[PDB]
Design a protein around this ligand. Sequence first.
Ligand SMILES: [Zn+2]
Ligand SMILES: [Zn+2]
Lengths: 306, 306
Amino acid sequence: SGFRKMAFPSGKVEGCMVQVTCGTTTLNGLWLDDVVYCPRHVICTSEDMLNPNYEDLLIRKSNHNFLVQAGNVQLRVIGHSMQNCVLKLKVDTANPKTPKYKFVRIQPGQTFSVLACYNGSPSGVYQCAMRPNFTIKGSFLNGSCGSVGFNIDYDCVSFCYMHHMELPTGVHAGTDLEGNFYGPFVDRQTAQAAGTDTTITVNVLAWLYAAVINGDRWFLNRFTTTLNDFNLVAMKYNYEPLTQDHVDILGPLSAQTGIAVLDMCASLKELLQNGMNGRTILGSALLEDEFTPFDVVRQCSGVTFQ
Amino acid sequence: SGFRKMAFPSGKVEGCMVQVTCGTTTLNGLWLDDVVYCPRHVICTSEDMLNPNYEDLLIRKSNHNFLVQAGNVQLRVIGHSMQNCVLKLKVDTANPKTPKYKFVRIQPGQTFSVLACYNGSPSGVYQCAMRPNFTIKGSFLNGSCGSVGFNIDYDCVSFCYMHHMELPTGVHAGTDLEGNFYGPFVDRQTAQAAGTDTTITVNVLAWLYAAVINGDRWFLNRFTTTLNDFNLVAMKYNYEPLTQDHVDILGPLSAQTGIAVLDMCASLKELLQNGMNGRTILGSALLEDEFTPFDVVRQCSGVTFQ
Ligand SMILES: [Zn+2]
Ligand SMILES: [Zn+2]
């Protein structure tokens, strides 16, 4: 028992991080097969960040102007195209450490692990949520650009995020591994606004089920509710709408705990409507939305061998 | 900017985990050099847990009754002694993956990363605190015995914890790598009580300094206080005593932020004495004590290369 915000083990990823220097400007890259991937703004410096003309910048400092090191200066750079906001470095040799991997684009509310890196070496790892408004509330200092997010479980890494920028509020923004930003952001540094950030309701409910399995049961209803009256209330507190798709992904948990989804939904309301009381649930005085239903189950039925 | 409960990258540790089976009973072990380390209770089964006679148990199921696998059945077991609560398996070959490592015993209030493992393969990683009363509030299911905790930064692993038991309340208890329990616990399953758990005051204060560096400044005093009047109050809320040693480890942070320790101390009081208001600080509606002063600094001045 107990319950912690757990990250995936980072081993299969630490061996894929390199550094990329192009001029000054040196950041982290991702070395899979014979390709390094990294933020394309590694080709910029100063007032370039204000309005970069990426195509004009990239046609001048050539292939030998890019240094990629894996644990020492010695990868040969013999190619380059720009895929969206990502650079792509055709290089000399495969990584003798490249794990089984894949590139995925994930949806708001899903979680993943970030391996925070600075100039090519791992700093730490934490688990977080892609927010409804396509930002992440990360922990990034200067030099961590190119750090990646991923999911495991299986034999592999599913890569889903590359870090690109800090917005003027402390929030973080980045791309998939095809260089398409999540959300309406661009790799420039003028003025960029994200969402109202809403609470990921299906994740709160999944977390309430984890609390019941842990024996933190004081908040339980008995009441019930309609999915309409629920969603009517969820909203005026900036909780995203629960739908039938959400109800279905939660059924495994309903089955374990003997608590129907609509009943838990009825329980969430009173926490929202009436009080929380600064009673605690699973360590926290608020409500928690960075655990998916799969994350919570990831403990009964899947984390190692038969 | 931003601030997350970060764990150390787990790569150097994933390659040191094996499984150990001895009869039935199969758990995780730690393969360094030519030695596997694991909880000695891997030699028990049923009502053995009630009062194990470890010396009597161990003199019968011999060296070939122990199977140790690293990513496949094939390590040869040719030796064994019992060091305290830890088994110690003289085996055939060195691990071709053994990192630079060391064994350390740490003090209450210090933090480390746990690599939760089930039958020899990594499940996830999280960062936590050794509580004043020598327990940890972990996340462990059956089969995770032998999972280890560690600190990195450097070139290595500092190993500080091996998981042994869940107490009847959900709290967790274990040993150093010399098999000496942290706290007054024994690897038996009768009745065992731990502390009143107190709050790690020097860690709360370090976390308040992280909040100021992040720009979460609403709670700041200006007032001041005496170390006596502070400690008088800290206590009746079950906060451990701040001492001059604590004040000294915090000086680097005081210097960065321009806020003297006694002034932050004066600020902590009002949070304790008057209200919190369910205003938030750095994500949390409470106060947070699983970040050390070193953890908080670990971001300005040390996490990669020059
Ligand atoms: Zn950058
Ligand atoms: Zn056990």
